[PDB]
Write a protein that binds this ligand. Structure first.
Ligand SMILES: [Mg+2]
Ligand SMILES: [Mg+2]
Ligand SMILES: [Mg+2]
Ligand SMILES: [Mg+2]
Ligand SMILES: [Mg+2]
Ligand SMILES: [Mg+2]
Ligand SMILES: [Mg+2]
Ligand SMILES: [Mg+2]
Ligand SMILES: [Mg+2]
Ligand SMILES: [Mg+2]
Ligand SMILES: [Mg+2]
Ligand SMILES: [Mg+2]
Ligand SMILES: [Mg+2]
Ligand SMILES: [Mg+2]
Ligand SMILES: [Mg+2]
Ligand SMILES: [Mg+2]
Ligand SMILES: [Mg+2]
Ligand SMILES: [Mg+2]
Ligand SMILES: [Mg+2]
Ligand SMILES: [Mg+2]
Ligand SMILES: [Mg+2]
Ligand SMILES: [Mg+2]
Ligand SMILES: [Mg+2]
Ligand SMILES: [Mg+2]
Ligand SMILES: [Mg+2]
Ligand SMILES: [Mg+2]
Ligand SMILES: [Mg+2]
Ligand SMILES: [Mg+2]
Ligand SMILES: [Mg+2]
Ligand SMILES: [Mg+2]
Ligand SMILES: [Mg+2]
Ligand SMILES: [Mg+2]
Ligand SMILES: [Mg+2]
Ligand SMILES: [Mg+2]
Ligand SMILES: [Mg+2]
Ligand SMILES: [Mg+2]
Ligand SMILES: [Mg+2]
Lengths: 59, 79, 136, 126, 192
RNA sequence: UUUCUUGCCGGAGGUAGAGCUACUGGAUGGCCGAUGGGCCCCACAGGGUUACUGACGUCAGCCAAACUCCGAAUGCCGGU
RNA sequence: GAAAGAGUGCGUAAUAGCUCACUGGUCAAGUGAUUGUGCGCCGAUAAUGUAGCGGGGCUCAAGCACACCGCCGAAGCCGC
RNA sequence: UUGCCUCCUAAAAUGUAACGGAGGCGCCCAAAGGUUCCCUCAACCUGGACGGCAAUCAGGUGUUGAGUGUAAGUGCACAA
RNA sequence: GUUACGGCGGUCCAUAGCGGCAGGGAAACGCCCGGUCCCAUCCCGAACCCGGAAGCUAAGCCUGCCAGCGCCGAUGAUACUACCCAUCCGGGUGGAAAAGUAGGACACCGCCGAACAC
């Protein structure tokens, strides 16, 4: 399975850890659509940064 | 009116500085403590100032043994 | 005028006053008691005045229990003194009260003057409080 | 109607025996090549064992309760020398030649001393 | 001493946790847990209004019947939590009990009577522990004093008790104390 | 890529909180209370025959940055 | 006995009176009390000039409480 | 007050300031060093006259409450 | 293999400890007798040690039973907190205490050695 991940808010006003988790996700500018796997790693990433991102499931 | 307090000492940066599950060198110092918060086990020696160090290569493992805190270095397998 | 006989150290930082009181939440020495509502600093002089009020109305019968003791101290410098240069001397001892804590406890037969005296005590405390009975 | 009002000699001395044995126990560590030779003593008999602390198992053991050593007309010294010699051939047959001596908390002299001299003269080097 | 059970309806909890419990509390339902010797604990929700009404009607301790999806359970209200400010109900512990069992019950005691002019009323102990049958739990205990003078210490073991009840508390406990009336000199001396 | 992030694995703490017949102090009211470890007659023997003091114990209910028989979430170190 | 409370008071030096509490007659269904709640009212008095919604004005809410559908809204994003 | 050491403030890795809260230090040991070995207290009830509230004490509940040079801190009855 | 039998050891060393009630001497474990010789008392064969089994399981020890005191401990709730929305007021997801409670509970296991049997 694959996930469609899109950022809804901005990077500023958020801490070093959430910013670096976002960089790991690969989301640099707002409203960016990025494709990833369904690993527990990515699940934890989305859990941590869920207030900045919106997730869609494909497949 | 004035105060007679306000002096202090320095900080000698005590505490445990090597944790379990990692690899340490020969003669590596594990814990800096005043008294016997931890106790030596296998391959663990005690310094003049009640510090704990390793005598052999391997991985540090903390444990409990008859109401005590003891540290050990296991002989990790040679690759 | 409740003051502890001696304390190991005579000055203490600003106490934390956060959370909901867990100890002494239920009244059991007698029948009737008073429960507070807000966070406050209740002083020994306030305790003395409230106890005087309770006895001054209940007269002959009954007796009083006090579930708090004002042993926390507070410092204050005198006026006309630049701030700093050490701590001031302690002036009044206080008992930090948390919400829902039982302050005073009464055991007197009749509801009328029992509630009357408890209200008399209520009107002298700085924060809101309510009557509570032994029945839950 | 029995009322205990203090300490009892047998219990306190048993505790003290473990107390004074723990001294040598703490420092002594025994491996497969160099196991620990522990000795126990009683008012009537003595006991010797060789144990490896790695597995907590005994290798060779001997005691004065056996009929062969009981048949000796000698004293506790004769029994101690005999059991020391016997445990010596047992250890040699097992294949251990370096060990360490655990006095078991007892003071050296008499039966223990005779045991030690017998062990040295038997050819077991420790 | 015979009592009658109290009928109420209850539902099993769907979600467990602080958030769900506080949401139910905001709604107006009190979370409760049902555990006992049956080795099958359950967690349920009750009606706050009906529960408070029953508590007021039958005191702190009452024998209750639980309706769980039509199933009938016999339980006793044994432990509970009350909010320090809102005086509401947040948790109650219900213990399954069948007819013909010995349980430990804490019961409140009341004192009534007429006192002499030199008599001061004092109540040090207000709740005592009594072992009795499930259907024989008393709601209140009363003691009477008439013409008491000087030292008239009322002992908990001296209290008359109904049939079929055992006093778990030791006889050394005192419930009511009678002493000489205070004086202005003593009142002004105390606290100084 | 040794860096970062996350999931999991191996770790010692001593904060929040809570507690005391568990230690160091503070504190409310009772019970036997012999013996104030003691005084209306000092008898070497009847009681505060007298409102005190009443220790030990016990019923219970609180408080403490320099109290911890307990003890998280975080963060930190190491590996995958 | 229907009900007199060593009387809740405003009454006289002290009596005596006006009363009242509970009760009895006509009318004819709501009458009381605390309980938890959302809004409210008073508590509210300073100095150049309204001056404590930005102003006009707004309950025939343009205020507050809860849901629904939309729009405006930057140098953020997308298009060339 | 300016140097050094103990604890807290110090938010459970180290660290982390203030004219913040409490105290000390500019030695001693020819043994208080080292080996080996013997043994474990203080609390406790009683008393041939002193000698009693405590002197030393045997009996015989007693896992540290006596204590381990010099403040605090950690331990040490498996002993330092 | 059995035993109401002794040593050496274990475990995030009390579910294993304390106390009360009963039972054991075949071998062993204990108590015991007396100090010629080894050895010792800051005195003393108390302890250590020296030589023996006349006597005895009462202590010690073990076994069995008691929840009297200690001990372990849920499910659920409450306090706390990482992150985020909401014009202070507050809520959503994740983690989950301490105390108390139903209860559990009078240790388990390994290697040798003693009597009987094979
Ligand atoms: Mg040195
Ligand atoms: Mg040294
Ligand atoms: Mg508490
Ligand atoms: Mg007030
Ligand atoms: Mg790599
Ligand atoms: Mg952890
Ligand atoms: Mg831990
Ligand atoms: Mg500490
Ligand atoms: Mg706290
Ligand atoms: Mg204490
Ligand atoms: Mg309590
Ligand atoms: Mg603080
Ligand atoms: Mg603390
Ligand atoms: Mg930290
Ligand atoms: Mg990592
Ligand atoms: Mg209402
Ligand atoms: Mg406007
Ligand atoms: Mg639009
Ligand atoms: Mg634009
Ligand atoms: Mg752009
Ligand atoms: Mg420090
Ligand atoms: Mg630190
Ligand atoms: Mg700085
Ligand atoms: Mg100085
Ligand atoms: Mg020396
Ligand atoms: Mg003695
Ligand atoms: Mg030394
Ligand atoms: Mg025999
Ligand atoms: Mg002798
Ligand atoms: Mg016996
Ligand atoms: Mg015995
Ligand atoms: Mg416990
Ligand atoms: Mg136990
Ligand atoms: Mg749970
Ligand atoms: Mg934010
Ligand atoms: Mg708000
Ligand atoms: Mg728990």
């Amino acid at each position: 399975a694959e996930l469609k991940i899109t950022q809804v808010r901005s990077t500023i006003g958020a801490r070093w850890k959430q910013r670096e988790s976002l960089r790991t996700l690969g989301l640099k500018k707002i409203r960016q659509s990025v494709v990833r796997e369904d690993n527990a790693q990515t699940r934890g990433l989305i859990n941590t940064v869920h207030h900045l991102v919106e997730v869609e499931e494909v497949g | 009116s004035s105060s007679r307090n306000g002096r202090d000492s320095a900080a000698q940066r005590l505490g445990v500085k090597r944790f379990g599950g990692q690899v340490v060198k020969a003669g590596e110092i594990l814990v800096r403590q005043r008294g016997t918060h931890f106790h030596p086990g296998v391959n663990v020696g005690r310094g003049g100032d009640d510090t704990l160090f390793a005598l052999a290569p391997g991985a540090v493992e903390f444990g409990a043994k008859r109401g005590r805190k003891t540290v050990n270095i296991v002989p990790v397998a040679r690759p | 005028m409740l003051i502890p006989r001696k304390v190991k150290h005579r000055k203490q930082h600003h106490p934390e006053q956060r959370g909901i009181a867990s100890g002494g939440t239920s009244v059991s020495f007698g029948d009737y008691g008073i429960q507070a509502l807000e966070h406050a600093y209740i002083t020994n002089r306030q305790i003395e005045s409230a106890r005087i009020a309770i006895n001054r109305h209940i007269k002959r019968g009954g007796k009083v229990w006090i579930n708090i003791f004002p042993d926390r101290p507070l410092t204050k410098k005198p006026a006309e003194t630049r701030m700093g240069s050490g701590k001031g001397s302690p002036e009044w001892w206080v008992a930090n009260v948390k919400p829902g804590r039982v302050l005073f406890e009464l055991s007197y037969p009749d509801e009328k003057t029992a509630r009357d005296a408890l209200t008399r005590a209520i009107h002298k405390l700085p924060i809101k409080a309510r009557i509570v009975t032994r029945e839950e | 109607a029995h009322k205990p009002v203090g300490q009892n000699i047998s219990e306190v001395r048993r505790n003290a025996r473990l107390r004074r044995h723990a001294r040598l126990r703490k420092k002594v560590a025994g491996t497969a090549e160099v196991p620990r030779l522990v000795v126990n003593r009683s008012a009537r008999h003595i006991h010797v064992q060789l144990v490896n602390d790695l597995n907590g198992t005994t290798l060779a053991a001997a005691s004065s309760i056996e009929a062969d050593v009981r048949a000796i007309d000698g004293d506790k010294k004769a029994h101690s020398v005999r059991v020391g010699q016997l445990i010596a051939e047992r250890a040699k047959a097992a294949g251990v030649e370096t060990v360490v001596f655990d006095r078991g908390g007892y003071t050296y002299g008499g039966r223990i001393a005779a045991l030690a001299d017998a062990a040295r003269e038997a050819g077991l080097k420790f | 001493t015979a009592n009658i059970p109290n009928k109420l309806t209850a539902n099993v909890r769907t979600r467990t946790g602080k958030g769900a419990s506080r949401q139910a509390r905001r709604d107006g339902k009190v979370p409760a847990v049902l555990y006992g010797h049956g080795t099958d604990p359950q967690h349920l929700e009750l009606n706050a209004r009906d529960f408070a009404a029953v508590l007021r009607s039958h005191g702190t301790n009452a024998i209750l019947t639980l309706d769980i999806e039509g199933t009938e359970q016999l339980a006793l209200t044994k432990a509970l939590d009350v909010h320090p400010i809102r005086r509401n109900i947040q948790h109650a512990d219900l213990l399954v009990v069948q007819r013909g069992e010995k349980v430990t019950v804490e019961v409140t005691v009341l004192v009534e009577g007429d006192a002499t002019p030199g008599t001061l009323v004092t109540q040090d102990a207000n709740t005592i522990e009594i072992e009795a049958e499930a259907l024989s739990i008393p709601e209140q205990l009363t003691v009477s004093v008439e013409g008491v003078e000087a030292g008239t210490q009322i002992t908990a073991g001296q209290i008359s008790l109904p049939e079929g009840v055992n006093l778990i508390s030791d006889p050394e406990l005192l419930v009511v104390n009678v002493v000489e009336a205070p004086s202005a000199e003593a009142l002004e001396e105390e606290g100084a």
